[PDB]
């Protein structure tokens, strides 16, 4: 019932190999819907979901202009961060930013987000109050002072409480047939003998949307968290996701094991056993 809009910016320097690359992608929930790549011959914000294609030229012109400006601003920012950490011109570095808004089933703002990382380490984040910053170190304190002087937090609050939520609700309505449709997993349990002594039970969940899912193995009703191998939820490429959970069981004890599946698309949570 709740939804999110997020943008993910990646800026990466590559000294000796041109100017830093700037990439930006937008998501609603687990659905990508736009992209921008400064390495393109003619960089533009481009559609990646059918329900955004109906936006007019003024939309695509705005998003392209913002991203082209961001390409330059993030290049300047990467130069600034190199200075803050006394880093040589010779190394490559990464600046990442993720921001956006969460809304409830009624469309009201639950929380806004703006977080940044430098070389994979948290750097600065807008606090949940949308009014103050948390800086990770003395370099990020310099960014904080710049952003306080530019009244950045006030602008984030305005965006996050306003246009972010308004456009997210617009997207949720234009893409309702997919964005507001939870597809349940198709499930099954496989059995892979290892030895005469034990075998693997693997519980599969396929074709589900959104990616949030719980797969657990119980033995005599007790969760086997420590003994369960979970793979990372992975995309099928058709918008849906896949996941499995595996446990190693003593031969002949298989019926003491139950796989439990929780997912928004299911009428009721599932309990599964190996069916030989």
């Amino acid at each position: 019932g709740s939804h999110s809009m997020r943008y993910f910016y990646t800026a990466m320097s590559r000294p000796g190999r041109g100017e830093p690359r700037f990439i930006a992608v937008g998501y609603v929930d687990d659905t990508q819907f736009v992209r921008f790549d400064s390495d393109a011959a003619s960089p533009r914000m481009a559609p990646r979901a059918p329900w955004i294609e109906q936006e007019g030229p003024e939309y695509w012109d705005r998003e392209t202009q913002i991203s082209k400006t961001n390409t330059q601003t993030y290049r300047e920012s990467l130069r600034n961060l190199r200075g803050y950490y006394n880093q040589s011109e010779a190394g490559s570095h990464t600046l990442q930013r993720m921001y956006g808004c969460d809304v409830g089933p009624d469309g009201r703002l639950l929380r806004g987000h703006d977080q940044s990382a430098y070389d994979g380490k948290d750097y600065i984040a807008l606090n949940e109050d949308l009014s103050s910053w948390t800086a990770a170190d003395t370099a990020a304190q310099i960014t904080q002072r710049k952003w306080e002087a530019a009244r950045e937090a006030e602008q984030w609050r305005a965006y996050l409480e306003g246009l972010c939520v308004e456009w997210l609700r617009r997207y949720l309505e234009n893409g309702k047939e997919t964005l507001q449709r939870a597809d349940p997993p198709k499930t099954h349990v496989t059995h892979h003998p290892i030895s005469d002594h034990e075998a693997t039970l693997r519980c599969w969940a396929l074709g589900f949307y959104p990616a949030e899912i719980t797969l657990t193995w119980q033995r005599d009703g007790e969760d086997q968290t420590q003994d369960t191998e979970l793979v990372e939820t992975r995309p099928a490429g058709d918008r849906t996701f896949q996941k499995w959970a595996a446990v190693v069981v003593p031969s002949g004890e298989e019926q003491r094991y139950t796989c439990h599946v929780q997912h928004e698309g299911l009428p009721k949570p599932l309990t599964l056993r190996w069916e030989p």
């Binding site: 914000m45 998003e63 400006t69 961001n70 920012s77 921001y99 940044s116 600065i124 602008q155």
Partner: peptide
């Protein structure tokens, strides 16, 4: 809808 382009770091 992107946030407007803001201040450098």
């Amino acid at each position: 809808h992107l946030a407007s382009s803001g201040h450098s770091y």
